[PDB]
């Protein structure tokens, strides 16, 4: 299984991760969805990258093959609490963070609370902002096994339907049913779910401190997340760039994988 | 006077031009304003470009040093079929257009028109839309010669202000008071002038006919035309990506020069 990776002791947690490449440090972080893990993430932007960068990219904890503490409280200040915990196992002092989605929120609540710690950011979809809950967020977050509950999803995150076969949607159902996955995942963000859009957001005043260079990208076409947030995170952060990509879903690294690697790789090669 | 360049005969009137480098044409259209010509517009965007591609940067008719004929009438379609005029005159069958402001309307203008002779596009801070005026845009088009009102123009142009120097301002002073300069372009623009935006914009069913990889830019902070306008041409034309430069005005190549060219050669090396 290719999503499994290295093992490390990280905030107490016994975490799943991939380390590739050397030089200037980049975290990838990725999205939240059943099955979800860094490799299903990062599996294409890794390799382009590492070929610069070093690319670590950590299976969050309650998602992926990091462990799944007994009574754990899935929190954003949990989730930045096992970023930094990585960070610190593994002597990076300060790097790049890449946040898709979920991870974007993480990404701009560790760069908030650890200032030092971070350089550059690439927001991706990201979560940051109270966007209202759409149709797309509560049917992914809401999402209960079977092939064609998968196959809804994977339409809802894609532009191009003809990406999403019945080989797909079956080997994201295996992943989302493995030991522990669907129940992990169900318990983090029970209805009304626009109460973890909120827990997930910073304030827009918060939100202006961040000095850092910044990148934020958005498919036009996302389901899951407005472009409207995006736009909004492009006004609140100063040294903000904004690329939207059209014919591009939630997933830019994955549809306009190409593109979103060239934008990336540049943007990191600016320092 | 480097903004004389080479001279040619198109669409009966006697171009001033600039063409340097080989391969895929890509015809660089400058914006409006008091003084504007190719040269001052693209100075720090053909020498990167010309390394990859033939580019060729010509005067509008009525702007810089191509010839403004007697009695002639600008209209949107009249520079149209300048900018074929001139492809025409070069052998130049496709190329890419960079449209810049005023120029964005134009490459939008010529696509629709001539279709089959456009590849790809890049709109900066581009007509095309019909945006409510603004102060910033009625005082470029409203200019009468002056080192402060140049400089007011500059600091309308500019984020960082910084950029304009009393040398910069008495340059394009005297180059908005050359013989015929003001003359012409006084006449261009007159009030009302929500009236020449929207002669200069297409329609919204146009707009989405447009079946070119388009790739627009604008900068956050423009104070000519409204971001707003630049996010409507990115909904509205399909094969297209939208990137805006955070402390940026209207002028992305000149302040955001090194990130423009890259992310506008990568655009075409796509091609």
């Known amino acids: 299984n290719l999503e499994i990776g290295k093992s490390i002791l990280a905030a107490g947690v016994l975490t799943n991760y991939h380390d590739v490449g050397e030089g200037q440090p980049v975290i990838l972080i990725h999205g939240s969805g059943p099955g979800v893990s860094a490799y299903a993430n990062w599996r294409l932007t890794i390799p382009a990258l590492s070929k610069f960068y070093r690319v670590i990219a950590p299976d969050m904890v309650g998602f992926g093959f990091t462990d799944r503490p007994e009574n754990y409280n899935y929190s954003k200040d949990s989730w930045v609490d096992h970023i930094i915990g990585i960070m610190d196992a593994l002597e990076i002092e300060k790097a790049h963070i890449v946040g898709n989605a979920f991870?974007?929120?993480?990404?701009?609540?560790?760069?908030?609370?650890?200032?030092?710690?971070?350089?550059?950011?690439?927001?991706?979809?990201?979560?940051?902002?109270?966007?209202?809950?759409?149709?797309?967020?509560?049917?992914?977050?809401?999402?209960?096994?079977?092939?064609?509950?998968?196959?809804?999803?994977?339409?809802?995150?894609?532009?191009?339907?003809?990406?999403?076969?019945?080989?797909?949607?079956?080997?994201?159902?295996?992943?989302?049913?493995?030991?522990?996955?669907?129940?992990?995942?169900?318990?983090?963000?029970?209805?009304?779910?626009?109460?973890?859009?909120?827990?997930?957001?910073?304030?827009?005043?918060?939100?202006?401190?961040?000095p850092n260079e910044t990148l934020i990208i958005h498919g036009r076409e996302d389901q899951v997340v407005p472009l409207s947030s995006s736009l909004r995170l492009g006004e609140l952060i100063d040294r903000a760039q904004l690329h939207v990509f059209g014919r591009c879903g939630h997933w830019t690294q994955i549809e306009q994988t190409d593109r979103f690697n060239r934008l990336v790789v540049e943007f990191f090669n600016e320092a």
């Open 103 to 210: 991870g974007g929120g993480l990404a701009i609540a560790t760069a908030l609370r650890y200032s030092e710690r971070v350089d550059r950011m690439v927001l991706m979809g990201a979560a940051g902002t109270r966007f209202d809950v759409t149709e797309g967020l509560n049917a992914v977050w809401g999402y209960t096994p079977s092939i064609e509950n998968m196959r809804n999803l994977l339409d809802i995150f894609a532009y191009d339907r003809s990406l999403v076969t019945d080989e797909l949607a079956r080997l994201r159902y295996e992943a989302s049913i493995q030991p522990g996955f669907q129940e992990s995942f169900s318990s983090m963000f029970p209805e009304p779910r626009q109460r973890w859009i909120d827990a997930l957001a910073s304030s827009d005043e918060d939100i202006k401190t961040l």
